[PDB]
Amino acid sequence: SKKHTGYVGLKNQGATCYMNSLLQTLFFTNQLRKAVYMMPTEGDDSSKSVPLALQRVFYELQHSDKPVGTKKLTKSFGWETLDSFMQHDVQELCRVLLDNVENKMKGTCVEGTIPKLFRGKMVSYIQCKEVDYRSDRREDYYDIQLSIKGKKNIFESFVDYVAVEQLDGDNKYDAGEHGLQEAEKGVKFLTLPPVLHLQLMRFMYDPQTDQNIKINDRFEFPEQLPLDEFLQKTDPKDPANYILHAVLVHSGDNHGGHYVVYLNPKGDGKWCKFDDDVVSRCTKEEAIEHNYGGHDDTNAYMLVYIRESKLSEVLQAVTDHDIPQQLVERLQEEKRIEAQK
Ligand SMILES: O=C([C@H]1Cc2cc(Cl)cc(-c3ccnc4cc(CN5C(=O)CCC5=O)sc34)c2O1)N1CCNCC1
Numbered sequence: 001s002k003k004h005t006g007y008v009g010l011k012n013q014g015a016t017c018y019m020n021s022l023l024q025t026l027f028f029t030n031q032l033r034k035a036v037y038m039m040p041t042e043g044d045d046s047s048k049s050v051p052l053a054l055q056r057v058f059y060e061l062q063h064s065d066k067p068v069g070t071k072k073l074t075k076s077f078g079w080e081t082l083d084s085f086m087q088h089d090v091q092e093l094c095r096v097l098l099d100n101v102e103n104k105m106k107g108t109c110v111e112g113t114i115p116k117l118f119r120g121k122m123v124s125y126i127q128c129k130e131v132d133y134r135s136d137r138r139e140d141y142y143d144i145q146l147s148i149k150g151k152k153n154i155f156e157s158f159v160d161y162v163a164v165e166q167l168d169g170d171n172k173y174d175a176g177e178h179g180l181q182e183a184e185k186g187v188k189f190l191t192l193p194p195v196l197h198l199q200l201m202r203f204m205y206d207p208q209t210d211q212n213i214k215i216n217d218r219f220e221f222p223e224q225l226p227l228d229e230f231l232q233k234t235d236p237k238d239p240a241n242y243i244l245h246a247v248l249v250h251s252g253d254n255h256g257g258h259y260v261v262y263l264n265p266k267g268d269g270k271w272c273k274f275d276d277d278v279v280s281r282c283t284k285e286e287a288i289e290h291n292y293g294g295h296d297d298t299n300a301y302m303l304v305y306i307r308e309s310k311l312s313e314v315l316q317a318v319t320d321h322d323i324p325q326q327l328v329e330r331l332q333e334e335k336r337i338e339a340q341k
Pocket residue numbers: 018085086087088089090091145199200201202203204250253254255257299300301
């Protein structure tokens with residue numbers, strides 16, 4: 001309900017699984033929302049424009065009192081069924097949406113916005129111990145998938161992510177003209193993006209069974225997340241102190257089940273729980289501490305963090321002015337014609 005919280009829900013579409021969680025997470029990334037409204041979609045066809053459908057949802061989430069539909073957006077990118085959602089993960093859907101949006105933004109006033117918000121850079125290195133050979137690759141990333149099994153927390157997951165693997169014994173390094181070799185393998189963060197998307201690896205392959213078994217472990221994650229010690233070169237002018245923004249959560253059976261996002265939309269520690277059409281207020285503890293794990297003696301799977309330095313910019317106030325007039329004309333013209341029944 002909008003009166004209690006200020007925010008509105010999305011319609012209970014069970015087929016969607018994790019979409020409603022992601023849409024809210026992306027909508028309350030305000031800098032994206034403003035940029036999305038600027039996309040020049042006056043050209044595009046209503047039924048099939050992914051940019052337009054994400055403008056429609058955003059528009060409505062901002063303006064509506066009653067819960068917001070997603071039927072037109074699901075039809076655009078072509079994941080109408082439950083199996084289309086099951087087959088993919090949340091980060092892949094986030095790529096399907098943002099890769100459309102970034103591509104529409106090229107050659108516009110709002111180009112670069114998706115990399116501005118979401119794209120960090122990292123080095124993957126292989127280094128031989130005895131011989132002088134080193135292979136570096138630079139990779140961009142839009143999201144980090146962290147290991148949780150045996151890890152108490154995010155600090156420990158990052159320790160693991162960056163930690164150095166030894167290529168010795170049977171699994172030595174094939175080092176070209178220099179032959180098979182004892183070597184160190186590792187990864188190093190260069191930049192951490194303003195909006196940081198972390199997936200927690202809740203599934204592993206199992207040797208017996210021949211299937212993916214889920215992990216219902218206590219995995220602790222903090223409101224304030226310092227990450228300078230996981231960068232190669234730090235900056236005193238801009239530390240990598242991250243502030244928690246959203247927590248995406250699953251419960252119940254995997255073949256379906258119930259999805260919720262917990263959110264901190266102003267970044268002021270005032271938490272709400274977005275259960276599909278029912279937005280409500282909740283404690284910090286309901287959002288953070290209570291979504292840690294199977295502690296009776298429900299699991300968090302994605303976490304969003306925002307860079308403290310970039311917080312005011314990222315979560316800048318959206319106004320009705322920030323949506324173009326022609327887009328307001330178009331989207332109200334649908335609501336005029338569709339109501340006329
Ligand atoms: O089993 C499920 C249900 C139930 C279910 C339970 C939980 Cl606690 C999380 C998800 C979930 C939902 C969305 N995204 C992601 C990403 C995750 C990170 N991760 C892995 O763990 C392995 C590889 C990877 O990237 S976990 C996840 C989920 O979905 N699905 C079948 C497979 N794809 C999703 C649907």
